[PDB]
Nucleic acid binder design. Structure first.
Ligand SMILES: Nc1ccn([C@H]2C[C@H](O)[C@@H](COP(=O)(O)OP(=O)(O)OP(=O)(O)O)O2)c(=O)n1
Ligand SMILES: [Ca+2]
Ligand SMILES: [Ca+2]
Ligand SMILES: [Ca+2]
Ligand SMILES: [Ca+2]
Ligand SMILES: [Ca+2]
Length: 903
DNA sequence: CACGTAAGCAGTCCGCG
DNA sequence: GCGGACTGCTTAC
């Protein structure tokens, strides 16, 4: 095979690299890397090296890496640019792998692990590691085995061996329900003392050295705990065995409110699954415990246990070890679905970066652009300092708060990257400037054409038409990948609905799911076979299609995030190619495009409907428009439609065959106006929205910018079996809104949009009646708890103290001294409940760590003192009041003259 | 060692015969 | 009691 790297590190004048060789074996080597950097030379100097602006440079080959670094310092001291890749492991990889890396993931060792530590005196801090590690489960992707290290003897209790036979039994039978499909894959290793356990773990770790190290909170808990515990028992140098190169750094991550002390293990690439999840999943969760996420992603039940975790090993060691195993499997299960490890490897190798660098769009693009430019013997510019400067972004139209019966939405495909590609925006394609006119003057086609020679943005910038930028070139490659996957996701989504339709009339048969590729639209032949299938076979088909869709989702949306990150990076002061002229070229163009095409659509629709000056476009944000279709419908007459699908068909056909061509014409004119390199403003239909035909449903409503709901029947060519709510910004979408309230608000909305005012009233009445019976957790608010210390004045609230912080302080007072109670962690999330006046907590609210039951010693009083009235008014009524007033209806029957009569 | 801006809502402080 | 200026959190793009 072709060789590829696993890990790369810089250690003094040495590059340390783990790799896979041509025989597909894992290898290491230490390389005395001889780096080059560049300096501008005179034109008379004959060279093959040019900077991005075509100015010649001379190569400086250094005897080592320290020499290269000190030369940089001397160049600074002189006042002259030091060009080339200053991060040497990137140059190294670029030099070593000068070809498209093709990797084999079966050769990459991926470790998934989690440890247990019994702690009678509060949370067991990694930096002290004062308590014994009494369990470790470590899954090795190459062996496909869970290696389990079990401490039988501890200061905190001596226990019997764990039983795999009991582990595998149903919970209802006293066992642990360890999933059967991993039972044969567990290798259980009991130990009479911690030292032999750790010693064994280390030797095992040396035999099977992780390349990708993952797990849940491994970076903040398991890794530093293991390292520090080994350090305290054996010494630092024994702890350093956790690094293939015997090197580690007790690091400092600089977040906005504090700093977490992590351990960098050199020669390992740590991707904590909690971090992958937060970056790649596009959820905002009220809690990030594994229990919570596992239930969310997989629909599995909470691993329940009697008592506290600090007493679980002693009371039920059997269950303790099973849970440690299951927890490790659960990450594998989430990854099997989401495929974030595959994503990271995909992106990491594509970029030629350390795998953990996928967290940084800036590092990723720096590596991509450098590799692209190096191929052409070009020399990247030095990184420079810039002060932080605000700049303008998108345009958002002020909507008229109202109900909106029929709506059709459109937006730009990959808007900012397409603008980059259309205009030819790159650091080295800048041609000059022109004198700007007010934006509205371009929007209305009254301003002078900017240039008949160069490609332009309405921000005043001009670009070359006759040559490609490295930014456009490289952003196009990723965009094209993005497009392939989204095709795969949308087909799987369309296939899913075909399956949901066939589920209305399932056959009574015993059959099997069809072997198909869910990534391509089902053929007529497959559609026919599906109409004959049982419920069981259809339901397994539907599961597979939806997993195929999630996989496409993961792949497309994160490549979209990456290319969008390139547009944003141009406005980040740490980006080698930082430039507010380029950043602003993009956003100002976006504003023009949205408002241009608003005009064109209003003009067009007036024209076809035979009218003048009527406002069709009701709203738009950044690259989208929302078109009221009431008049399109009225023009033909609602009466003429057979059912709901008949008008959805009509509007779909109208958008595709009439509106899109006119939009296309609209944007080609703007392209000529700006004299751009290439027309790439593709504004395709998104949603067709309206009430069920013959219903009292209102179809949709807007409350303000970024706040709206639509009853959608078709989304980007997916014709739903059942209408789906598109809700943006409203409380149902906010992780701070109580779970049960999100759900209740959503049904209120569904009723408004699909059924009408009277249906809404019926539901409101019921929820209001029954809501005091809801589980306290389902009705608690959620908030991040940042800067708790600042507002802590002797255990009490300082000035300007935020409500949720106040609740943490109340919590901290009620649990004072009791070491069993879980502490609130800085920057993590809390559940929040308001308290009736005169409560024994002595304040108006309480807050505890989210995803958890509040500790048993205060639970009782919380449940008794909760302020239901305040909670209903704040989380439910006030937002519902906003929806309904916007929509011009009432959630409660208003008083009237009819009130004088008898029922 | 570091993708972007726009913009809505909850809450605190504070004025107000 | 409710505006208005302000911090803090959060979501649409
Ligand atoms: N997380 C996000 C989402 C949006 N935007 C900017 C860049 C996008 O190009 C633009 C439009 O937002 P979209 O959500 O419509 O994203 P795209 O237009 O890029 O992709 P799609 O083809 O899915 O519409 O907003 C951004 O910078 N970061
Ligand atoms: Ca645990
Ligand atoms: Ca878009
Ligand atoms: Ca059937
Ligand atoms: Ca959009
Ligand atoms: Ca689209």
């Amino acid at each position: 095979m072709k060789e590829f790297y696993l890990t790369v590190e810089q250690i003094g004048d040495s590059i340390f690299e783990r790799y896979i060789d041509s025989n597909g074996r894992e290898r290491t080597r230490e390389v005395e890397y001889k780096p080059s950097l560049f300096a501008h030379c005179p034109e008379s100097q004959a060279t093959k090296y040019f900077d991005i602006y075509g100015k010649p440079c001379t190569r400086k080959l250094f005897a080592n890496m320290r020499d290269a670094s000190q030369w940089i310092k001397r160049m600074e001291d002189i006042g002259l640019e030091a060009l080339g890749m200053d991060d040497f492991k990137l140059a190294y990889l670029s030099d070593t792998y000068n070809y498209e890396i093709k990797y084999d993931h079966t050769k990459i060792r991926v470790a998934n692990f989690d440890i247990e530590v019994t702690s009678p005196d509060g949370f067991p801090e990694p930096s002290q590691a004062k308590h014994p590690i009494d369990a470790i489960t470590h899954y090795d992707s190459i062996d496909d085995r869970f290696y389990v290290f079990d401490l039988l003897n501890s200061p905190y209790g001596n226990v019997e061996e764990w039983s795999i036979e009991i582990a595998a039994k149903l919970q209802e039978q006293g066992g642990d329900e360890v999933p059967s499909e991993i039972i044969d894959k567990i290798i259980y290793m009991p130990f009479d003392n911690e030292k032999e356990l750790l010693m064994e773990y280390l030797n095992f770790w040396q035999q099977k050295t992780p390349v990708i190290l993952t797990g849940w909170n491994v970076e903040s808990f398991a890794i530093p705990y293991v390292y520090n515990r080994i350090k305290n028992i054996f010494g630092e140098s024994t702890a350093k065995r956790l690094s293939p190169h015997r090197k580690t750094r007790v690091k400092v991550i600089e977040n906005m409110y504090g700093s977490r002390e992590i351990i960098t293990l050199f020669g390992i690439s740590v991707l904590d699954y909690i971090d992958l999840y937060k970056k790649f999943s596009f959820t905002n969760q009220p809690s990030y415990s594994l229990d919570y996420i596992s239930e969310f992603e997989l629909n599995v039940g909470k691993l329940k246990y009697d008592g506290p975790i600090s007493k679980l090993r002693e009371s039920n060691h059997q269950r303790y070890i099973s849970y440690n195993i299951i927890a490790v499997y659960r990450v594998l299960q989430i990854d099997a679905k989401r495929q974030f490890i595959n994503l990271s490897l995909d992106m990491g190798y594509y970029a030629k970066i350390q795998i953990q660098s996928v967290f940084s769009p800036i590092k990723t693009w720096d590596a991509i652009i450098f590799n692209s430019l190096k191929e052409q013997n070009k020399v990247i510019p030095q990184g420079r300092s810039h002060p932080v400067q605000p700049y303008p972004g998108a345009f958002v139209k002020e909507p008229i708060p109202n109900r909106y019966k029929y709506v059709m939405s459109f937006d730009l495909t990959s808007a900012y990257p397409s603008i980059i590609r259309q205009v030819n925006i790159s650091p080295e394609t800048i041609a000059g400037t022109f004198k700007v006119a007010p934006l509205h003057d371009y929007i209305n086609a009254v301003a002078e054409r900017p240039s008949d020679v160069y490609s332009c943005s309405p921000n005043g910038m001009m670009y070359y038409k006759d040559r490609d930028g490295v930014v456009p070139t490289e952003i196009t490659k990723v965009f094209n990948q993005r497009k392939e996957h989204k095709g795969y996701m949308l087909a799987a989504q369309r296939n899913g609905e075909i399956i949901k339709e066939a589920l209305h009339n399932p056959n009574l048969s015993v059959d099997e799911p069809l072997d198909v590729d869910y990534r391509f639209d089902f053929s007529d032949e497959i559609k026919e076979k599906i109409k004959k299938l049982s419920a069981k076979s259809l339901n397994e088909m539907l599961f597979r299609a939806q997993r195929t869709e999630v996989a496409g989702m993961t792949a497309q949306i994160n490549r979209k995030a990456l290319i969008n990150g390139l547009a944003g990076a141009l406005g980040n002061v740490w980006f080698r190619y930082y430039d507010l002229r380029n950043a602003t070229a993009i956003t100002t163009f976006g504003q023009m495009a949205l408002q241009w095409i608003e005009r064109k659509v209003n003009e067009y629709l007036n024209e076809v409907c035979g009218t003048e000056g009527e406002a069709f476009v009701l709203y738009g944000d950044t690259d989208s428009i929302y078109v009221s279709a009431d008049k399109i419908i009225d023009k033909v007459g609602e009466s003429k439609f057979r059912d709901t699908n008949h008008w959805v068909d009509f509007l779909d056909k109208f958008a595709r065959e009439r509106m899109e061509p006119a939009i296309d014409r609209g944007f080609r004119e703007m392209c000529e106006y700006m004299n751009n390199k290439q027309h790439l403003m593709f504004m395709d239909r998104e949603a067709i929205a309206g009430p069920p035909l013959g219903s009292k449903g209102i179809g949709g409503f807007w409350t303000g910018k970024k706040r709206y709901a639509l009853n959608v029947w078709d989304m980007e060519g997916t014709r739903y079996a059942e209408p789906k709510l598109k809700i943006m910004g409203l409380e149902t979408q906010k992780s701070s809104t109580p779970k049960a309230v999100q759900k209740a608000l959503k049904e209120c909305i569904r009723r408004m949009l699909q059924e009408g005012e009277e249906s809404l009233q019926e539901y409101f009445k019921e929820f209001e009646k029954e809501f005091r019976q809801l589980n306290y957790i389902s009705i608690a608010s959620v908030s991040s708890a940042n800067n708790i210390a600042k507002y802590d004045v002797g255990g009490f609230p300082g000035p300007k103290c935020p409500f949720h912080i106040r609740g943490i302080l109340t919590y901290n007072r009620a649990i004072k001294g009791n070491i069993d109670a879980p502490q609130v962690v800085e920057g993590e999330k809390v559940y929040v409940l308001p308290l009736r006046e005169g409560n024994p907590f002595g304040d108006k609210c309480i807050a505890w760590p989210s995803g958890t039951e509040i500790t048993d010693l205060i639970k009782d009083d919380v449940l008794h003192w909760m302020d239901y009235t305040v909670l209903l008014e704040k989380t439910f009524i006030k937002p519902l009041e906003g929806f309904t007033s916007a929509a011009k209806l009432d959630y409660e029957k208003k008083a009237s003259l009819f009130d004088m009569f008898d029922f």
